[PDB]
Write a protein that binds this DNA or RNA. Structure first.
Lengths: 50, 185, 626, 48, 43
RNA sequence: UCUCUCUUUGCCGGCUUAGAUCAA
């Protein structure tokens, strides 16, 4: 019923493992796109408030 | 100096520790520390530079031109190992360790032992030269076949050891590995 | 009613007669029979404490002393401390109206130091002397002297071991009566292996499984060498539980050792309802002061860990030793309290035939430097004149005396040097730590050295969890990492601890042991009184951040304990000893060129040092030259 | 350390990892089960 | 008593593992749509 | 002929020594 505590943590690790996908370093390109979107939105907002 | 963020080490002992970082960067610097660059930038000089001080001697102006001292020309590594390399004196520690004045102390104690007196603590100090047990039972007799106990530059700390790295010139184990007699019958 | 049920009530008149007609009486009995709690009541009822007389019973354990004092106070229907009180080292709860006083051995030695004849006590009872503590045997030696001088003073000796003949010879047969109480124990049968075992834990686990599968219900108490085997037994017992059969009880494993937190030591007493069979993996804790009922079957490995100190190297090591015959008998008799029980000792009777009968005393297994300070304070020039029950090793005595001489407490003639020597003799602590405190007056920084001493004597002020909160503990500690070593880290932690209103939630958040800090508070208060006994002010603090002169005082206190880094990662002591830094210390890999430690604990391969603090070479050079 | 008795949770994680990775990446699969080695994972998959 | 070794009424299955793995995904990210209030932001 | 719903519904990164290794 209560599989200790270590088995819970390895199950959680495996759960995060199986649905990772998206490669490994593909998390950089989308992050840069989101940062660029935020920077442009801030720039447009400053233009609009001016 | 804030000792850098110390949380990086956590546990994870030696064989899993990432690499040492001089400036939170995975790199080496110094010729004898594993870096492919030594000095400022493969050079002797420094960032600011270095200039000699003005000189003037007239039997009264050279008095202001003092001598040279140890510290003023060394650097942080040099001072660190200068502190590391200072070992001398000792004397008193060696005299009363490992008795001399203690014999006079025994004179104070009125030893008068003639035949010395021993305590079972000394049988336990003999136990310092007996065993620490090897997870065996009280009555376990154990076995005698199962008990066991030049220089130059190095081959490289990562190049490991093998049959390759032993002394080809061997003259050890003169007689300690050899019996003095053998039963013939 | 519980007073009358104990077997000792029927011997009350006889014990009183023996106490009155004999100057010294040896009482032999089993723990929990009433000797600890009912003898004071019995002799108070007789009238020994009448007319200003006091009944002083020595309990060498602080927790045992306090618990027995509270139990006696409550059993007599008197307010605590009014008639019966307790006084343990650096913690006094007594009163002028108190008649039954429970006292520690060290404080009583101090009272002997101030009062050589103990005029306020007519009778003193020595209890739990079977553990043969250093303070206990030194007190026994002085007590032979006071009974020699005082004919009115009476002694009652209570012991759980058969040593009465040796005490009779030491004390003189004409003045001691050897009496033995007749308790009751259900007959316990021993079972022995025909052949010596190779793996005693595997033999124990085999017997534990056979007991579970073939014997009636009953908790099994095991005896194991040390704390390293506990987790191995947990793991094997868990695997056996996974593969347990329906005909076998649900067998719960329970650790029991000295290093556990108190709540873990309380987990064993928990009652497991249903078909649950307890097994107590105890190293040596379940030998004294431990009373789990329902213990039926005990399997004894015959090995116990202990501590031996090396004077030549000033180290201490935890070694495995075969148990003594007395320990085996005690372990066998531990089972059988409530119903009949069986013991399974994992060896042969031929192995039993060779072990030495009783474990050697702690006066023969501890550091005698406090003992030599005590005797020299009483005024004994020649150590051989004192009536030792067992002669201590001469080489240990000369080693301790030479250590004391190089410390400066003794002159070339072996007498106390200056006010320093006598003041050190008056100190409860060791001479090494006391030297810094006594010399701090010359430098006006007594406060921080006092805090350092209180932290050192109280113990470890940090708590290290075994779960993931260890990282949280590191972060909790991350605010107070001092570049100069662990000692100044402890000073900073202590300063902010008193600067945080003694908040217990703060101690939980920072994973800090509040009990140790309180004990350090009591230590510093009593040492403040100790210095004020010499009219030394204790308001001296260093207003500057320069801890250098505090380090001068420490180097005066830890002259021998210096070391410098070697290329191999180890450190070379000034005495040419290879030591290794403990992982706990902050300066584990900082590669500090010169280091200073306090305590050394030695393992089978590496000698580890504790309480690491960095130093500078020129301080040491200037200190050694003068 | 390494090994044990192959609890059901380990076996099901093994099945899922084989589904996601294939039958030729036993090192990557064994990274999930910290108590087992790639040889052990391969032996269990091909034997049970 | 944390010692109820009774086999669980429900056993962890692989398909459960993958289903509760994929539940970790959310909807596609919703960015605040850019507003074009004059010809400049249009061109 | 509208509206909604269901169902039917054919359907729209490569190579090499598996690139090479892996104990808290």
């Amino acid at each position: 019923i209560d599989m200790d505590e270590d088995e819970k943590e390895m199950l959680s690790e495996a759960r995060a493992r199986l649905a990772n996908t998206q490669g490994k370093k593909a998390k950089r390109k989308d992050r840069e796109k989101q940062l660029e979107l935020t920077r442009r939105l801030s720039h447009l907002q400053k233009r609009r408030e001016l | 100096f804030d000792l850098e963020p110390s949380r990086i080490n956590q546990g994870v002992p030696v064989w899993k520790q990432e690499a040492r970082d001089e400036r939170n960067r995975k790199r080496f610097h110094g010729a004898f520390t594993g870096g492919f660059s030594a000095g400022y930038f493969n050079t002797v000089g420094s960032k600011e530079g270095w200039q000699p001080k003005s000189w003037k001697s007239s039997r009264n102006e050279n008095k202001s031109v003092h001598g040279m001292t140890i510290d003023d020309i060394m650097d942080e590594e040099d001072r660190a190992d200068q502190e590391l390399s200072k070992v001398y004196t000792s004397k008193i520690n060696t005299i009363d360790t490992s008795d001399s004045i203690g014999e006079k102390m025994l004179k104070n104690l009125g030893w008068n032992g003639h035949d010395f007196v021993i305590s079972p603590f000394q049988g336990y100090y003999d136990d310092t030269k007996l065993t620490n047990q090897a997870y065996h039972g009280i009555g376990y007799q154990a076995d005698d076949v199962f008990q066991l106990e030049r220089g130059g530059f190095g081959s490289g700390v990562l190049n490991d050891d093998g049959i390759e790295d032993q002394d080809i010139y061997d003259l050890g184990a003169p007689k300690m590995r050899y019996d003095k007699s053998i039963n013939i019958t | 009613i519980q007073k009358k049920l104990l077997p000792i009530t029927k011997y009350r008149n006889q014990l009183l007669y023996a106490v009155e007609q004999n100057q010294i009486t040896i009482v032999l009995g089993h723990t929990g029979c009433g000797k600890t709690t009912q003898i004071p009541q019995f002799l108070y009822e007789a009238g020994w404490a009448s007319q200003n007389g006091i009944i002083g019973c020595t309990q060498p354990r602080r927790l045992v002393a306090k618990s027995v004092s509270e139990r006696v106070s409550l059993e007599l229907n008197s307010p605590p401390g009014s008639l019966c009180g307790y006084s343990i080292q650096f913690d006094h709860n007594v009163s002028e109206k108190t008649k039954i006083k429970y006292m520690t051995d060290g404080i009583l030695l101090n009272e002997i130091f101030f009062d050589p004849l103990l005029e306020r006590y007519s009778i003193v009872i020595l209890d739990e002397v079977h553990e043969r503590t250093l303070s206990t045997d030194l007190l026994l030696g002085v007590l032979k002297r006071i009974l020699e001088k005082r004919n009115d003073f009476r002694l009652v000796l209570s012991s759980a071991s058969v040593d009465a003949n040796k005490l009779s010879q030491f004390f003189g047969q004409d003045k001691v009566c050897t009496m033995s109480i007749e308790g009751k124990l259900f007959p316990v049968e021993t079972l022995f292996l025909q052949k010596p075992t190779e793996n005693y834990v595997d033999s124990a686990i085999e017997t534990v499984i056979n007991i579970n599968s073939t014997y009636p219900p009953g908790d099994i108490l095991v005896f194991l060498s040390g704390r390293k085997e506990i987790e191995y037994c947990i793991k094997k017992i868990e695997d056996s539980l996974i593969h347990a059969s329906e005909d076998c009880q649900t067998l719960v494993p329970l650790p029991l050792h000295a290093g556990l937190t108190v709540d873990e030591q309380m987990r064993v007493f928990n009652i497991y309802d249903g078909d649950f069979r307890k097994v107590i993996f105890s190293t040596n804790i379940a030998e004294t002061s431990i009373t789990i009922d329902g213990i039926v079957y005990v399997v004894d490995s015959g090995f116990n860990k202990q501590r031996i100190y090396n004077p030549y190297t000033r180290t201490s090591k935890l070694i495995n030793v075969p148990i003594s015959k007395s320990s085996a008998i005690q372990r066998s008799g531990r089972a059988g309290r409530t119903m009949r029980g069986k013991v399974f000792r994992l060896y042969t009777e031929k192995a039993y035939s060779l072990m030495k009968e009783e474990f050697e005393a702690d006066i023969l297994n501890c550091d005698m430097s406090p003992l030599v300070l005590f005797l020299k304070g009483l005024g004994l020039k020649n150590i051989l004149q004192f009536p030792f029950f067992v002669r201590p090793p001469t080489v240990h005595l000369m080693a301790a005396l030479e250590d004391l001489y190089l410390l400066g407490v003794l002159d070339e003639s072996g007498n106390l040097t200056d006010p320093l020597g006598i003041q050190i003799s008056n100190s409860f602590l060791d001479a090494n730590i006391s030297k810094a405190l006594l010399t701090s007056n010359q430098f006006g920084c007594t406060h921080e050295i006092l805090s350092i001493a209180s932290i050192l004597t109280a113990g470890e002020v940090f708590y290290n969890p075994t779960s993931s909160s260890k990282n949280d503990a590191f972060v909790a500690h991350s605010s107070f990492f001092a570049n100069e070593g662990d000692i100044i880290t402890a000073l900073n932690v202590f300063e902010s601890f008193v600067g945080n209103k003694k908040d217990l939630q703060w101690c939980r958040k920072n994973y800090l042991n509040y009990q140790t800090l309180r004990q350090a508070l009591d230590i510093r208060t009593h040492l403040v009184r100790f210095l004020n006994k010499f009219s030394i002010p204790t308001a001296q603090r260093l207003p500057s951040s320069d801890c250098s002169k505090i380090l001068k005082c420490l180097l005066d206190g830890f002259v021998r304990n210096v070391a410098h880094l070697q290329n191999d990662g180890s450190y070379k002591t000034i005495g040419g000893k290879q030591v290794w830094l403990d992982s706990s210390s902050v300066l584990h890999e900082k590669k500090t060129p010169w280091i200073m430690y306090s305590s050394a604990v030695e393992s089978e391969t590496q000698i580890f040092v504790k309480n690491i603090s960095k130093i500078e070479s020129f301080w040491l050079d200037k200190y050694y030259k003068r | 350390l390494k090994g044990g008795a192959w609890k059901n949770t380990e076996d099901e994680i093994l099945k899922a990892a084989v589904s996601k990775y294939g039958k030729n990446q036993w090192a990557r699969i064994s990274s999930l089960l910290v108590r087992k080695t790639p040889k052990q994972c391969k032996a269990r998959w091909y034997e049970w | 008593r944390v010692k109820n070794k009774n086999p669980a009424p429900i056993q962890i299955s692989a398909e459960q593992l993958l289903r509760e793995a994929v539940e970790r995904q959310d909807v596609a990210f919703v960015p605040p749509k850019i507003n074009i209030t004059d010809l400049e932001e249009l061109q």
